[PDB]
């Protein structure tokens, strides 16, 4: 039972453990706040204690002292279990996807956690983007691909048929 503490926010989105990473100040907590309002579960905010459960699984949780809490610049500390009820929290969850928030600049990824390749996607933080919505869909799309619906793979297949066709 070996544990390590990671910086990010772990939320249960559509049943999938999604770890949100990114430089402090990117607004990880605020986005997580909007996700619980949309009906998702907060596992751990800021400090996520993870431990490898086997060759292909990573479990995360919040140190007891931070359980149920969110620190939102300006407001302070809020207890989502107290503001939204049981439906907003969860003791822990296996980490399925990693969504890293990099701040946008003009000029099949995988991340290793305890010797386990967790998939990862990087979304740009840029004015006008609703981060909670994109992460939520990222999880949603991830789940769909598990169910056998890969929009990308299907499109690339359709594009080759089209090309081959226009080639007369």
């Amino acid at each position: 039972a070996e544990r390590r503490s990671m910086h990010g926010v772990l939320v249960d989105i559509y049943g999938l453990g999604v770890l949100i990473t990114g430089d402090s100040g990117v607004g990880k907590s605020e986005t997580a706040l909007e996700l619980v309002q949309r009906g998702h579960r907060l596992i751990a905010d800021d400090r996520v204690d993870v431990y490898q459960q086997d060759e292909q699984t990573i479990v995360g949780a919040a140190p007891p002292i931070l359980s149920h809490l969110l620190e939102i610049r300006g407001l302070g500390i809020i207890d989502v279990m107290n503001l939204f009820g049981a439906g907003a929290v969860r003791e822990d969850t296996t980490i399925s996807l990693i969504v890293h928030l990099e701040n946008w600049t003009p000029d099949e990824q995988t991340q290793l956690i305890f010797d386990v390749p967790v998939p990862k996607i990087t979304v740009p933080v840029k004015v006008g983007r609703n981060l909670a919505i994109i992460i939520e869909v990222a999880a949603m799309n991830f789940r769909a691909k598990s169910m056998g619906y890969d929009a990308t793979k299907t499109f690339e297949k359709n594009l080759n048929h089209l090309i081959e066709h226009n080639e007369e």
């Binding site: 544990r3 503490s5 910086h7 402090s24 100040g25 905010d45 800021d46 400090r47 204690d49 140190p63 002292i65 931070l66 809490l69 620190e71």
Partner: peptide, 16 residues
């Protein structure tokens, strides 16, 4: 043994 990101306060205080 545990280490946190010193730029985020929740983590620092969590160490107690």
């Amino acid at each position: 043994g545990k280490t946190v990101n010193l730029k985020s306060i929740m983590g620092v205080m969590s160490l107690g």
